[PDB]
Scaffold this active site. Structure first.
Site, PDB file in Angstrom:
ATOM      1  N   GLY A  48      28.342   3.566  30.648  1.00 24.37           N
ATOM      2  CA  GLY A  48      29.149   2.571  29.945  1.00 24.37           C
ATOM      3  C   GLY A  48      29.004   2.699  28.439  1.00 24.37           C
ATOM      4  N   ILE A  97      24.683   8.670  37.987  1.00 25.77           N
ATOM      5  CA  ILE A  97      25.606   7.844  38.742  1.00 25.77           C
ATOM      6  C   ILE A  97      26.732   7.351  37.828  1.00 25.77           C
ATOM      7  CG2 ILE A  97      25.776   5.656  40.072  1.00 25.77           C
ATOM      8  CD1 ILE A  97      22.555   6.377  40.667  1.00 25.77           C
ATOM      9  N   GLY A  98      26.392   6.490  36.879  1.00 22.46           N
ATOM     10  CA  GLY A  98      27.371   5.910  35.972  1.00 22.46           C
ATOM     11  C   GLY A  98      26.979   5.962  34.516  1.00 22.46           C
ATOM     12  N   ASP A 132      34.010 -12.297  35.367  1.00 22.18           N
ATOM     13  CA  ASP A 132      34.623 -11.000  35.637  1.00 22.18           C
ATOM     14  C   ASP A 132      34.133 -10.347  36.924  1.00 22.18           C
ATOM     15  N   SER A 140      27.090   3.278  25.661  1.00 22.78           N
ATOM     16  CA  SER A 140      25.676   3.164  25.272  1.00 22.78           C
ATOM     17  C   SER A 140      24.724   3.408  26.448  1.00 22.78           C
ATOM     18  CB  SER A 140      25.396   1.791  24.668  1.00 22.78           C
ATOM     19  OG  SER A 140      25.678   0.749  25.589  1.00 22.78           O
TER      20      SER A 140
HETATM   21  C1  LIG Z   1      22.227  -3.803  36.528  1.00 20.31           C
HETATM   22  N1  LIG Z   1      22.545  -2.498  37.143  1.00 20.31           N
HETATM   23  C2  LIG Z   1      22.126  -2.057  38.398  1.00 20.31           C
HETATM   24  C3  LIG Z   1      22.620  -0.759  38.558  1.00 20.31           C
HETATM   25  C4  LIG Z   1      22.465   0.115  39.721  1.00 20.31           C
HETATM   26  C5  LIG Z   1      21.289   0.073  40.474  1.00 20.31           C
HETATM   27  N2  LIG Z   1      21.166   0.806  41.661  1.00 20.31           N
HETATM   28  C6  LIG Z   1      22.210   1.625  42.148  1.00 20.31           C
HETATM   29  O1  LIG Z   1      22.047   2.186  43.247  1.00 20.31           O
HETATM   30  C7  LIG Z   1      23.480   1.709  41.312  1.00 20.31           C
HETATM   31  N3  LIG Z   1      24.506   2.549  41.767  1.00 20.31           N
HETATM   32  C8  LIG Z   1      23.578   0.964  40.140  1.00 20.31           C
HETATM   33  C9  LIG Z   1      23.338  -0.490  37.347  1.00 20.31           C
HETATM   34  N4  LIG Z   1      23.291  -1.560  36.491  1.00 20.31           N
END
Ligand SMILES: Cn1cc(-c2c[nH]c(=O)c(N)c2)cn1
Length: 255
Positions: A19, A16-17, A132, A21
């Protein structure tokens, strides 16, 4: 293609993502159930950075019991090398949902606005100010908005939601979070951020500071909504609406 957290084997669906690290994965357990695993690599992280993740986890674990509007954290693995956080899997982030959507139904907008004040209010009660705030710290799960970031550690970069006091604090209170939520609701009402039109960022900062600058609130049929927006986007923190006040406003309460 597979990772283990507390003996449990989770097979990676997609990423998904990230950052730097960190890396978030859409995973599946043994029983095919979906979850989202956040992975942090501490290998190069500093002493101050490690206590920011240690703090965010603690709060995210405590505050889970205080609001269904805060992201579920089922389990976690902490070592000197990494951090594995097993959380609930959302449909889409608020920023991606807004950037896509053309229309916004007043019933949905109002509902999301209630979900946000509930999360933001929870964190404020435990002495946390996010500062933020952006639509990306929110996530749609079971048609309900949920807070993923407490603004403690490093988030996994728009200047359109900056509180004026923050820009002037170069030489932070709960009213800082009101301004930011005010900007997310304004963008949910008028389709754009209050200072989204100011291309130059040095000038965009000059505007948020300047009181002789008039923010536009076009005449809307939702009377209460326009008053909410005018109360949240007050430049003086002292003269700005509070979270317990917004929660008792006619916008939230009148059906
Ligand atoms: C603290 N945190 C929760 C997530 C997260 C959890 N669940 C998800 O569906 C999402 N796109 C991100 C990323 N960092």
């Amino acid at each position: 293609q597979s990772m283990s957290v507390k003996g449990r084997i989770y097979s990676i669906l997609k990423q998904i993502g990230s950052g730097g690290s960190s890396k978030v994965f859409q995973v599946l357990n043994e029983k095919k159930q979906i979850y989202a695993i956040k992975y942090v690599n501490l290998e190069e992280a500093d002493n101050q950075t490690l206590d920011s993740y240690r703090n965010e986890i603690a709060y995210l674990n405590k505050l889970q019991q205080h609001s269904d509007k805060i992201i579920r954290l089922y389990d976690y693995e902490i070592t000197d090398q990494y951090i594995y956080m097993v959380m609930e899997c959302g449909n889409i982030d608020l920023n991606s949902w807004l950037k896509k959507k053309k229309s916004i139904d007043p019933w949905e907008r109002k509902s999301y606005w209630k979900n946000m004040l509930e999360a933001v209010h929870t964190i404020h009660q435990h002495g946390i100010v996010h500062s933020d705030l952006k639509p990306a710290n929110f996530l749609i799960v079971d048609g309900m908005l949920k807070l993923i970031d407490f603004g403690i550690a490093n988030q996994m970069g728009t200047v359109n939601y900056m509180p004026p006091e923050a820009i002037k604090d170069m030489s932070i209170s709960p009213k800082s979070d009101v301004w930011s939520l005010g900007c997310i609701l304004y963008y949910m009402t008028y389709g754009k951020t209050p200072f989204q039109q100011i291309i130059n960022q040095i000038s965009k900062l000059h505007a948020i500071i300047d009181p002789n600058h008039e923010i536009e609130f076009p005449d809307i049929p939702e009377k209460d909504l326009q008053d909410v927006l005018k109360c949240c986007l007050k430049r003086d923190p002292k003269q700005r609406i509070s979270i317990p006040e917004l929660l008792a406003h006619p916008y939230v309460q009148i059906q």
